[PDB]
């Protein structure tokens, strides 16, 4: 096989249809299902799979008590087949760590996992299921990465890391790998103030990532990387339709190269597909918590500071808990264009549901259609009372 090249553009997005759903917490009430969080999806030339960061216990096991914490030596990046739950018996460990990213280049796959204490963390880059490169913390404050898939163009796979405080300025870097080996890296450029957890997709020899400002921005920072020249830039989304969480209510005019006021120093991971009038942003329904999830067609959201919704689709109702969300595409499908896809993490347990002592999630995934399909809402489905 040769290295994949981003030769196509995006298909027209007129609506979203279900792609995959695992019902992990329903099934796990009586099965050997692992406690997880921070999931994603990623394809190979021959199959697409579910990915997530395990917590080293099953939901019903006594060690599930205290799983709200995010960093320990008992986590690892796992992958199971599309739509099954993350089972003790069917999961394949990709690497050990509490932060990650992964992606195929046409030939084979590259995975990255970060572990260690907050002041002495390090990343080990696996290529073809073997360790190839290691990177030590440069700012001694929680080295961390995307938490969703990377993208490659002719062997080159860019990946973005951050090290430094959340509530303030950090040192973000963009590394350019090829066969797990570093070709180069460069510090963040452009107008972006802070960059966390990037969600990326590629089309026509270009890669675009929508990230999280935490510190301040309620409107999202966007990075554009050229995998051939190995350069990038950054800016913010102009639209007044805010998409972070927590966030203030929608203003009438937004800001293009400055983050949005009102709320600061917290957030959630998300994504968008910026393609002119073929632009769709996703966001939670509540401005206070991670409840609900909806997609909105906001033409030219990137460059137009007065853009508003033109069409929409509700994924999870306001009463139902959601969480992180990100992007992926099956770059090896047959066709004249790339079909956009995404997933949403449905968190159950602490902190919102404190009758239980654990924290876990399920996954709902959808892809675009050129048709105008009718909608349904996709919640987790588990009855918390059954766990008492």
């Amino acid at each position, epitope marked *: 096989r040769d290295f994949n090249n981003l030769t196509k553009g995006l298909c027209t997005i007129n609506s979203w249809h279900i792609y995959g759903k695992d019902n992990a917490v329903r099934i796990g009430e009586d099965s050997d299902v692992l406690v997880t969080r921070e999931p994603y999806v990623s394809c190979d030339p021959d199959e697409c799979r579910f990915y997530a960061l395990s917590q080293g216990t099953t939901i019903r096991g006594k060690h599930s008590n205290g799983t709200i914490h995010d960093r320990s030596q008992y986590r690892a990046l796992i992958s199971w087949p599309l739509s099954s739950p993350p089972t003790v018996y069917n999961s394949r460990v990709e690497c050990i760590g509490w932060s990650s990213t992964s992606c195929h280049d046409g030939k084979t796959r590259m995975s990255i996992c970060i572990s260690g204490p907050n002041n002495n963390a390090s990343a080990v880059i696996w290529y073809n299921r073997r360790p190839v490169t290691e990177i030590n913390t440069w700012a001694r404050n929680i080295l961390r990465t995307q938490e969703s898939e990377c993208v490659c163009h002719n062997g080159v796979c860019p990946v973005v890391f951050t090290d430094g405080s959340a509530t303030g300025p950090a040192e973000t870097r963009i590394y350019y790998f090829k066969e797990g080996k570093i070709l180069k890296w460069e510090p963040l450029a452009g107008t972006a103030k802070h960059i966390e957890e990037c969600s990326c997709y590629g089309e026509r020899a270009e890669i675009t990532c929508t990230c999280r400002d935490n510190w301040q921005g309620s409107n999202r920072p966007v990075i554009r990387i050229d995998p051939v020249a190995m350069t990038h830039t950054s800016q913010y989304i102009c639209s007044p339709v805010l998409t972070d969480n927590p966030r203030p209510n929608d203003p009438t005019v937004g800001k293009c190269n400055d983050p949005y*006021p009102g709320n600061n120093n917290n957030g959630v991971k998300g994504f968008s597909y910026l393609d002119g009038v073929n632009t769709w942003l996703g966001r939670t329904i509540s401005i*206070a*918590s991670r409840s609900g999830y909806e997609m909105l067609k906001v033409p030219n959201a990137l460059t137009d500071d007065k853009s508003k919704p033109t069409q929409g689709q509700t994924i999870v109702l306001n009463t139902d808990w959601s969480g992180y969300s990100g992007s992926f595409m099956d770059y090896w499908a047959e066709g004249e264009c790339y079909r956009a896809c995404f997933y949403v993490e449905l968190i159950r347990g602490r902190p919102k549901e404190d009758k239980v002592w654990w924290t876990s999630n399920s996954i709902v995934s959808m892809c675009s259609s050129t048709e105008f399909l009718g909608q349904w809402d996709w919640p987790d489905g588990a009855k918390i009372e059954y766990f008492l």
Partner: antibody
Amino acid sequence: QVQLQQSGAELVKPGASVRMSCKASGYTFTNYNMYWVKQSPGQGLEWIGIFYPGNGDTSYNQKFKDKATLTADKSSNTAYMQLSSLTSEDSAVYYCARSGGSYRYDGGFDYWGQGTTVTVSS
Amino acid sequence: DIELTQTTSSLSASLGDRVTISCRASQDISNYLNWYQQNPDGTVKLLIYYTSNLHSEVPSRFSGSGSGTDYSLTISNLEQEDIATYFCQQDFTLPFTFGGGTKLEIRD
């Protein structure tokens, strides 16, 4: 017609805890955010927090987290607020209002209760 | 958070006239500002919401306006039942904050 009726005045000693109610009527309780407000001399009107009976979500004003606890009884359509470790600084009038924007955080507080007065001292 | 300031806490006026109370926000709140009426008996009522929308069954002599940081409420021709304290509140971002209030007294 929408009507929110609150409990009676509380005369309490320092160090006690109290629990007041707000009985809702004339609307579908599970579809609206229920807000709580405090009114006192030399301080004015302050928002305390929010409880949405639809799924049990809550949020507090950093100032009042530790003092108050939002709870509700979906069957009796009653919402409650407990204030703990009472100090004379808590003597004031307390109100419960409804979200004019249903489950959203806009539209103002469209209907209020008449208020419950808590008087703390020895 | 956003601080709301209601200039002048007292407004002695005479029945029949047209008063105007104002509120100024520490920052742009994109029209997300509302007005309430607290009677001398304890009753609180929503008058206007979103800079100028009238809540149901509110006497049409009440009107509001503004933009950015400056907003106002106007009562065309005072009646005796307009004796109350008026407050402004924002809901552009949490936590919600209210103004200091302005006591309106129909001067004897």
